[PDB]
Structure 1
Amino acid sequence: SGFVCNTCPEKWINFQRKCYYFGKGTKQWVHARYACDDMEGQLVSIHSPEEQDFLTKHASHTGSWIGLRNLDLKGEFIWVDGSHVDYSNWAPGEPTSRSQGEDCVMMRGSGRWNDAFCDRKLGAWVCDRLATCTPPASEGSAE
């Protein structure tokens, strides 16, 4: 068994004290958020062009799922965390013409997001959660 203070091995990525999940599985957005709960995290919900690009680059064989869920379809996109989008990446500026539905947002290898029905065609689930490094706080800091 692997030691603690290090849960993110390959896909999963840890930083200052938080980690990301870029694993493979499921086939729907709702399945991604459910996966997050299993890891005790959250549906990514990327807010940094770097982070979105980070997973975007990490996701080659298939796109990735983010913490984005829209009301109906073309309405307002709200994050699974209950926070309206701030940057958004669904296409740089191409409104396309093939309108069929978009209840969630996906990420393509192109280097951004694509707003389309949660039931598109992905293969990798991504969620974020804090690292597994948390020792029992005994001595109170700053006495």
Structure 2
Amino acid sequence: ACPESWIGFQRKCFYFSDDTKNWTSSQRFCDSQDADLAQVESFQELNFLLRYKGPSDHWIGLSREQGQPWKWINGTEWTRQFPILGAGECAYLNDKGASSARCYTERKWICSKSDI
């Protein structure tokens, strides 16, 4: 189903970290579990993540270089559903939704993978 301790929602499995890492180290961790930093594709998914995450900021799998659009982990372009606030290069969830920061900062993170 989902691996031990991962949380199941709709067709995905989610890992919420206890520790903090920078964004690229977080994605390296997710990749080691055949997963990615969360690819949050829907409002229902966003709301599930906000409800479980607790008060800490958590990285998700959206990033950009300056003067380049937001990209998913696979390098394709993100199209807005919910907004990502600010001017940072890496995206995370705070208590109101998505925000952006410098990629070198340490936050908690969320991994996702398919349940299949």
TM-score by length of 2: 0.81
Q: 1:46 to 1:114 in 2, by over 3 A?
A: same
The match for 1:117 among 98, 102, 112 is: 102
Once residues 43 and 15 of structure 1 are traced to their aligned partners in structure 2, the CA distance between those partners, rounded to angstroms, is: 15
Matched, 1:7 2:6: no
Matched, 1:53 2:37: no
Q: Where does the alignment leave 5 or more consecutive residues of structure 2 unmatched?
A: none
If each structure's strand is expressed as a fraction of its own residues, which one has the higher value? 2
CA contact (8 A) 1:56 1:64 kept: no
Once residues 41 and 6 of structure 1 are traced to their aligned partners in structure 2, the CA distance between those partners, rounded to angstroms, is: 12
Once residues 63 and 55 of structure 1 are traced to their aligned partners in structure 2, the CA distance between those partners, rounded to angstroms, is: 11
> Shift in Å at residue 17 of structure 1?
4.6
- Note the alpha carbon deviations across 1:86-107, whole angstroms, 9 max, x for none: 225313xxx6xxxxx6111111
The match for 1:81 among 68, 74, 78 is: 74
> Shift in Å at residue 16 of structure 1?
5.0
**Percent of aligned pairs sharing the same letter:** 26
> Shift in Å at residue 125 of structure 1?
1.7
Q: 1:89 to 1:21 in 2, by over 3 A?
A: farther
Q: How does 1:69-108 map to 2 (within 5 A)?
A: 69-72=63-66, 74-87=67-80, 88-91=82-85, 102-108=88-94
> Shift in Å at residue 8 of structure 1?
4.4
Match of 1:62 in 2: 56
CA contact (8 A) 1:47 1:86 kept: no
Q: How many correspondences in the alignment?
A: 115
Once residues 80 and 54 of structure 1 are traced to their aligned partners in structure 2, the CA distance between those partners, rounded to angstroms, is: 20
Once residues 105 and 69 of structure 1 are traced to their aligned partners in structure 2, the CA distance between those partners, rounded to angstroms, is: 6
Amino acid at match of 1:126: I
CA contact (8 A) 2:2 2:13 kept: no
Q: Where does the alignment leave 5 or more consecutive residues of structure 1 unmatched?
A: 96-100, 134-143
> Shift in Å at residue 67 of structure 1?
0.9
SS in 1 for 2:83: coil
